[PDB]
């Protein structure tokens, strides 16, 4: 690669390792914030819009229930998420501003991106044109180049995890399955439609699973639906391990060729995992119009800007039952979460 790219990545790794080896802890508390609205909810946590009482700034606060984290075998995953987020720095990653814990919960306080999830915009418009899909895909290619050079795998790429910001660019959120991996890793995790064959088959796997998931994401952005789907997960998995993929006739020949190389069932033949690494993707014909430096510098005009009224507008997120943030009078699971 050009020495300027090599030097960029060498410094990125130096700065990551310094924060990785000495993580920040305990940098706010719950009563520093006013609760506004629930933005999302899952099996062991939720994300709430909050406002800091002294500065007036808005944030997305992820709240994880310690007891549910333990029951669902997510302890190490939640420790990975916070340790990685407090150590990374890249234009297309949502920034962690504070973290802390109390008797009941773990808290990660992230910047609030008001434009909504890419998933909502995709389903409202139907499908993105190839230039629009390519603008987003270029940001993911650069983000994975950064993460993989730090020995990090992301493991949850899908449209719900890509937020659209006030300039129309992507912010990747949700590091719940991200991990530092120097060789292979073995946990079964991720969303069925996006899993690579080697995860489904219980093999030791590597960063090539993120490049498979980028093929699924680019197909879904340009078609409007993912390439492998079915009513039951087991039927999705049969489709994935065949890798049989039919493309819409409106796909360009260059898009089909890129996708056959990202959706390659043999991980040793998959683009992103060959001798030339990410450069097989950056130099592919489907990306011939992409100015990689201009994208990184945020100098390209975006395909659209979300409609919203201000930094606290929630109109691009959906409505959930509003539940208490209860804090037990007694400490739960203190040992398991000592390092958080």
Ligand X SMILES: O[C@@H]1CCN(Cc2nc(C3(O)CCNCC3)cs2)C1
Residues flagged as binding site for ATP = 39-47, 62, 111-117, 158-161
Comparing every residue's Cβ against ligand X, the nearest one is: 73
Other beta carbons within 10 angstroms of residue 93's beta carbon come to 20
Q: Which two tokens stand for residue 243?
A: 């890798």
User: What minimum distance in Å lies between the beta carbon of 180 and ligand X?
Assistant: 12
- Give me the 74-93 binding string for ligand X, x by CB under 6 A, dash otherwise: --x-----------------
Which of these is catalytic: 31, 34, 65, 156?
Answer: 156
Binding mask 168-207 for ligand X (x = CB under 6 A): -------------------x--------------------
Cα 59 to Cα 52: distance, rounded to the nearest angstrom? 8
CB of 177 to ligand X, least distance (A): 10
Q: Which is nearer to ligand X, 155 or 270 (CB)?
A: 155
105-111 vs 58-65, strand pairing mode: antiparallel
Nearer to ligand X, 80 or 104 (CB): 80
**CA angle, 103 as apex, 98 and 109 as ends, to 5°?**
15
| Contact indicator for 171, 163 with CB cutoff of 8 Å | yes
CB nearer ligand X, residue 41 or residue 187: 187
Minimal CA–CA distance to 191: which of 144, 240, 139, 260?
Answer: 240
Cβ-Cβ contacts under 8 Å for 146 (sequence gap 6 or more): 9, 12, 88, 90
- Within the chain, strands assigned E span 33-41, 45-52, 58-65, 96-101, 105-111, 152-153, 162-164, 170-172, 179-180
Binding residues: 39-47, 62, 111-117, 158-161
DSSP letter for each residue of 40-107: EE-SSEEEEEEEETTT--EEEEEEEEHHHHHHTT-HHHHHHHHHHHTT---TTBPPEEEEEE-SSEEE
Q: Please answer whether residues 13 and 149 qualify as being in contact, where contact means their C-beta atoms are separated by less than 8 angstroms.
A: yes
Between 77 and 121, name the residue whose CB sits nearer to ligand X.
77
Least distance in angstroms from the C-beta of 5 to ligand X: 33
Task: Tell me if residue 156 is catalytic.
Answer: yes
Q: How far is the CB of 187 from ligand X (least distance, A)?
A: 5
In 3D space, the residue among 91, 34, 45 whose CA is nearest the CA of residue 312 turns out to be 34
Interface pick for ligand X out of 11, 53, 73, 250 (rule CB under 6 A): 73
Nearer to ligand X, 78 or 264 (CB): 78
CB 101 within 8 A of CB 337: yes
Q: Distance between CA 119 and CA 188 in Å, rounded?
A: 24
How many residues bind ligand X (CB under 6 A)? The answer is 3
Least distance CB 331 / ligand X (angstroms): 21
Q: Is residue 257 within the footprint of ligand X (CB under 6 A)? A: no
Decide whether 76 or 323 has the Cβ nearer to ligand X. 76
Closest separation between CB of residue 69 and ligand X, Å?
11
Residues that bind ligand X (CB under 6 A): 73, 76, 187
Q: Active-site residues: which are they? A: 156
């Amino acid at each position: 690669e050009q020495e300027s790219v090599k030097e960029f990545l060498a410094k990125a790794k130096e700065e990551f390792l310094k924060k990785w080896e000495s993580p920040s802890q305990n940098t706010a508390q719950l009563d520093h914030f006013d609760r506004i609205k629930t933005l999302g909810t899952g099996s062991f946590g939720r994300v709430m819009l909050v406002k800091h009482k002294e500065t007036g700034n808005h944030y997305a606060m992820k709240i994880l229930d310690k007891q549910k984290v333990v029951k669902l075998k997510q302890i190490e995953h939640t420790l990975n998420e916070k340790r990685i987020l407090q150590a990374v720095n890249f234009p297309f990653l949502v920034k962690l501003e504070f973290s802390f814990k109390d008797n009941s919960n773990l808290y990660m306080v992230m910047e609030y991106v008001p434009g909504g999830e890419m998933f909502s915009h995709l389903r409202r418009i139907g499908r993105f044109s190839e230039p629009h899909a390519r603008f987003y895909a270029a940001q993911i290619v650069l983000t994975f180049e950064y993460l993989h050079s730090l020995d990090l795998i992301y493991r949850d790429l899908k449209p719900e995890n890509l937020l659209i910001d006030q300039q129309g660019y992507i912010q990747v959120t949700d590091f719940g399955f991200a991990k530092r991996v120097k060789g292979r890793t073995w946990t079964l995790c991720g969303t069925p439609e996006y899993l690579a064959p080697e995860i489904i088959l219980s093999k030791g796997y590597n960063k090539a699973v993120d490049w498979w998931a980028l093929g699924v994401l680019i197909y879904e952005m340009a078609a409007g639906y993912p390439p492998f789907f079915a009513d039951q997960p087991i039927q999705i998995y049969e489709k994935i391990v065949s890798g049989k993929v039919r493309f819409p006739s409106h796909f360009s020949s260059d898009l089909k060729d890129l996708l056959r190389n990202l959706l390659q069932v043999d991980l040793t033949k998959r683009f992103g995992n060959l001798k030339n690494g990410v450069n097989d993707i950056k130099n592919h014909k489907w990306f011939a119009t992409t100015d990689w430096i201009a994208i990184y510098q945020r100098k390209v005009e975006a395909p659209f800007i979300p409609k919203f009224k201000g930094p606290g507008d929630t109109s691009n997120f959906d409505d959930y039952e509003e539940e208490e943030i209860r804090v037990s009078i007694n400490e739960k699971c203190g040992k398991e979460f000592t390092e958080f």
